[PDB]
Tab-separated table of C-alpha atoms in Angstrom:
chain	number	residue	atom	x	y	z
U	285	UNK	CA	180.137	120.432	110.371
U	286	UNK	CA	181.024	118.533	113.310
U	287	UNK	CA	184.694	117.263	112.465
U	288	UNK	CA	185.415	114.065	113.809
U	289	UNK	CA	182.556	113.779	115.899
U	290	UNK	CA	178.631	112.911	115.104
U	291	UNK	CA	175.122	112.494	116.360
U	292	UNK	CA	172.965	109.695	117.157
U	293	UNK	CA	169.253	110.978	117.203
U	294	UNK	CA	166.891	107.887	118.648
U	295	UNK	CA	163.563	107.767	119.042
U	296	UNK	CA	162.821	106.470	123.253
U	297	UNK	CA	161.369	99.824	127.141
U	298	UNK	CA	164.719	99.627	127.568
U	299	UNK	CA	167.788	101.781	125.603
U	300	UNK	CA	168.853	99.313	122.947
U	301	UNK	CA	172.333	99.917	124.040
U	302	UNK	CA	174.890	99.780	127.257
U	303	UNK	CA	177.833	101.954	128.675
U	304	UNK	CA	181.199	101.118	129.670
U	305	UNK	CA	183.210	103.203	131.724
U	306	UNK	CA	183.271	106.648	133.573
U	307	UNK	CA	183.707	107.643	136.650
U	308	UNK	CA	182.946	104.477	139.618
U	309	UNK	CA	183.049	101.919	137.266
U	310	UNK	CA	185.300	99.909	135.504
U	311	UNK	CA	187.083	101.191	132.466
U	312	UNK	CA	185.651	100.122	128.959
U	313	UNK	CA	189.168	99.225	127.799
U	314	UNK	CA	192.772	99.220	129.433
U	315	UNK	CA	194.432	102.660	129.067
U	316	UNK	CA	191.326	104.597	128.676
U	317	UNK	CA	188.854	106.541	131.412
U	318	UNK	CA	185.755	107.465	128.874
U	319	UNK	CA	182.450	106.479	128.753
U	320	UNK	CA	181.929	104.458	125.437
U	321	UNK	CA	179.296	102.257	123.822
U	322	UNK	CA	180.103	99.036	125.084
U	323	UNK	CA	176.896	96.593	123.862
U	324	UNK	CA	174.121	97.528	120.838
U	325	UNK	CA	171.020	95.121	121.018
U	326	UNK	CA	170.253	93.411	117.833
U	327	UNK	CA	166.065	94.655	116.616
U	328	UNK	CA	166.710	97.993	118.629
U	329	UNK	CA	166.235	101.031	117.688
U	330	UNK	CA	170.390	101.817	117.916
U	331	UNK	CA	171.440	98.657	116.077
U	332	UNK	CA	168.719	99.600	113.145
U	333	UNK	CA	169.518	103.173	113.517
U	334	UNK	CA	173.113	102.265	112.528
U	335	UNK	CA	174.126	105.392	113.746
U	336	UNK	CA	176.019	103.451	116.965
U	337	UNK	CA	178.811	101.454	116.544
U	338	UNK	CA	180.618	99.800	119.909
U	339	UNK	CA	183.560	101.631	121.011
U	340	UNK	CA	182.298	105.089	120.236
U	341	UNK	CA	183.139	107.234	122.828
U	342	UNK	CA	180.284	109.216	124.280
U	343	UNK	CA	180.852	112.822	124.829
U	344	UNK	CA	177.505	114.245	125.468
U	345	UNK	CA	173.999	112.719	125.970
U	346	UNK	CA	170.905	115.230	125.642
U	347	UNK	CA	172.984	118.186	126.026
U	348	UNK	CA	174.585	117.021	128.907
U	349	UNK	CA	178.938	116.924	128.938
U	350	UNK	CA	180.109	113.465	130.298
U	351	UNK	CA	183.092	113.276	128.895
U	352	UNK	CA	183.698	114.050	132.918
U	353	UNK	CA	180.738	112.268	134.306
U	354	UNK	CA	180.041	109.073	136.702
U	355	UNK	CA	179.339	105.823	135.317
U	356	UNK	CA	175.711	105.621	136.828
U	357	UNK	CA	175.114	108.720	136.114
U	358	UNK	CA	175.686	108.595	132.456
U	359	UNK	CA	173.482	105.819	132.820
U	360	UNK	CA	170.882	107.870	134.519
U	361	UNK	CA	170.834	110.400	132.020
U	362	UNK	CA	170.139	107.672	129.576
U	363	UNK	CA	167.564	106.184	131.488
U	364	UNK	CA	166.200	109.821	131.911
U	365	UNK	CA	162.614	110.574	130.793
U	366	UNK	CA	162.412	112.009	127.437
U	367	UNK	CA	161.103	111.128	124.010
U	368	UNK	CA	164.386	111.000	122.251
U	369	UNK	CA	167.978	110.352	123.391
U	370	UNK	CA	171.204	112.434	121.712
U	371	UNK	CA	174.626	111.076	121.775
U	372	UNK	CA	177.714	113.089	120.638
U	373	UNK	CA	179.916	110.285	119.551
U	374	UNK	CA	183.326	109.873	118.875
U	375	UNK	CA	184.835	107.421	116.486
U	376	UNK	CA	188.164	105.798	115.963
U	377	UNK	CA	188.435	104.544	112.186
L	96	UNK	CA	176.842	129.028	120.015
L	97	UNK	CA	176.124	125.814	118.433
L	98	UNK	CA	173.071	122.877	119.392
L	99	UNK	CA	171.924	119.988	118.940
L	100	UNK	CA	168.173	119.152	118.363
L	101	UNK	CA	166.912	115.938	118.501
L	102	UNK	CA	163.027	115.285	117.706
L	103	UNK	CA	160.525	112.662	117.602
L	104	UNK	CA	158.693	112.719	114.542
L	105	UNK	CA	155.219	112.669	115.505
L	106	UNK	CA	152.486	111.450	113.512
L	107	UNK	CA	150.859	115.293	113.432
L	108	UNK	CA	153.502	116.348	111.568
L	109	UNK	CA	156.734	117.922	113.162
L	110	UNK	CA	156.166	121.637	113.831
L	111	UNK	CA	158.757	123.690	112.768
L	112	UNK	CA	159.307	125.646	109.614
L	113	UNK	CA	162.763	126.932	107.463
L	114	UNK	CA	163.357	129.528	105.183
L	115	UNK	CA	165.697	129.851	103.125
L	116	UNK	CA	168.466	128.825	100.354
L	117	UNK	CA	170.127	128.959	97.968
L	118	UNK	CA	166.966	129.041	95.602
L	119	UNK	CA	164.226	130.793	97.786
L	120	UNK	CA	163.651	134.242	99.702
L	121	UNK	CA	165.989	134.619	102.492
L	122	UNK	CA	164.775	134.607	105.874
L	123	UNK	CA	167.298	137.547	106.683
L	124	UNK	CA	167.898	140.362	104.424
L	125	UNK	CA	171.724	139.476	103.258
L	126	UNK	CA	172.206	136.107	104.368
L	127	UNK	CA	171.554	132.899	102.022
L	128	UNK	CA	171.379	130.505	105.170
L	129	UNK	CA	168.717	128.126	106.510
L	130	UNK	CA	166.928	129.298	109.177
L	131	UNK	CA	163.889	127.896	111.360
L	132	UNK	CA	161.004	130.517	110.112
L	133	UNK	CA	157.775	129.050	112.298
L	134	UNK	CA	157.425	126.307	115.275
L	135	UNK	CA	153.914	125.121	115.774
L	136	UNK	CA	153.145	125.219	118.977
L	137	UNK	CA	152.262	122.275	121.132
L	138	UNK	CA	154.406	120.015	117.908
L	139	UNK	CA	157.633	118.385	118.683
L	140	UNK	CA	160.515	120.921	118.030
L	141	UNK	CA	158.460	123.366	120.684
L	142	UNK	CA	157.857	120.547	123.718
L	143	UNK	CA	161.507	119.999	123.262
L	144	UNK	CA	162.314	123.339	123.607
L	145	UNK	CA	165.607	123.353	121.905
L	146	UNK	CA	164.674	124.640	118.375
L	147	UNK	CA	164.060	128.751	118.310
L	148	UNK	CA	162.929	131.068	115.049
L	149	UNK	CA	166.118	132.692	114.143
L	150	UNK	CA	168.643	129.491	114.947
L	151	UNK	CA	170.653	129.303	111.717
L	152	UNK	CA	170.582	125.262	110.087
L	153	UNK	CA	173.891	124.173	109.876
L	154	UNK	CA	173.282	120.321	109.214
L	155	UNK	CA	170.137	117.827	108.913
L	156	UNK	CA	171.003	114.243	109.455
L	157	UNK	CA	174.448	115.218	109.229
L	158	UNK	CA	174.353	116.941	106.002
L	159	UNK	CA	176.210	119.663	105.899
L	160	UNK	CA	172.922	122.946	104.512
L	161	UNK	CA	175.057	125.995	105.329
L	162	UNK	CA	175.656	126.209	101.274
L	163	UNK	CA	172.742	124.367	100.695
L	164	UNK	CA	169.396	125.025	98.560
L	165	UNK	CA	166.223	125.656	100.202
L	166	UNK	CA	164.556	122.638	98.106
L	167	UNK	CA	167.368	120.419	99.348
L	168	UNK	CA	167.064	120.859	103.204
L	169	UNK	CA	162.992	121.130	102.444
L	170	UNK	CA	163.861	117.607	101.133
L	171	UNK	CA	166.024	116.832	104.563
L	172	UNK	CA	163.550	117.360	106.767
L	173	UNK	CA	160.778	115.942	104.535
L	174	UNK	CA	162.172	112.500	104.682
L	175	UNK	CA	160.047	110.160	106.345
L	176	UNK	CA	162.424	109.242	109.094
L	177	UNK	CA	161.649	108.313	113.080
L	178	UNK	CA	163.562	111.136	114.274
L	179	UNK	CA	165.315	114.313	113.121
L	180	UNK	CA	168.759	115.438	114.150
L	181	UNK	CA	169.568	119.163	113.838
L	182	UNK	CA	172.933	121.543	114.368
L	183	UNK	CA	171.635	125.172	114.800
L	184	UNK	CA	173.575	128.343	115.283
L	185	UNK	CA	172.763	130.185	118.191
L	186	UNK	CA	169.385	130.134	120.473
């Protein structure tokens, strides 16, 4: 029961995946300030995983609320140490 | 109230237990819900530190178990799969 919203659960060489947007950085796309997922490697984990789409917008990752954050750190979350990596996602149909 | 779990599968085995459903003993006297029964320590869901005896399973892999049968969400977590994505209630 997570309405329109849903989690990506990978397994951590590199993410599989890049960020757009945030806070300090560039916005993914024009009229919008979120972080989203703005690149999914092809053999990664993510792209197999099928659980991440580009243009999700990313909410939380391991816990942590960005929906507020700083580019870099978003990305430093990612790059983070930990054995798995959690994204709250967002989707537009 | 609500988390989100996310574990590695290890090779050992992941840890943590459920009991349960809508075909098994409860866990709690009057509830029919899915709850985590056991962690083994030193296993995945207890390094991560995010799972807790007592958090109620509200969805595996995005499946929805609040209504669910205890041989169903057995099956859930069963699945050999590289990670495992859990919504608890509380904890």
């Amino acid at each position: 029961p997570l309405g329109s919203r849903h989690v990506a659960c990978l397994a951590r060489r590199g993410l599989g995946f890049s960020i757009a947007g945030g806070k300090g950085s560039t916005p993914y796309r024009a009229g919008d300030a979120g972080i989203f997922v703005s690149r999914i490697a092809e053999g990664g984990a993510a792209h197999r995983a099928g659980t991440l789409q580009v243009g999700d917008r990313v909410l939380s990752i391991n816990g942590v609320d960005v929906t507020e954050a700083r580019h870099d750190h978003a990305v430093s979350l990612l790059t983070a140490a930990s054995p798995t990596i959690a994204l709250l996602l967002e989707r537009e149909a």
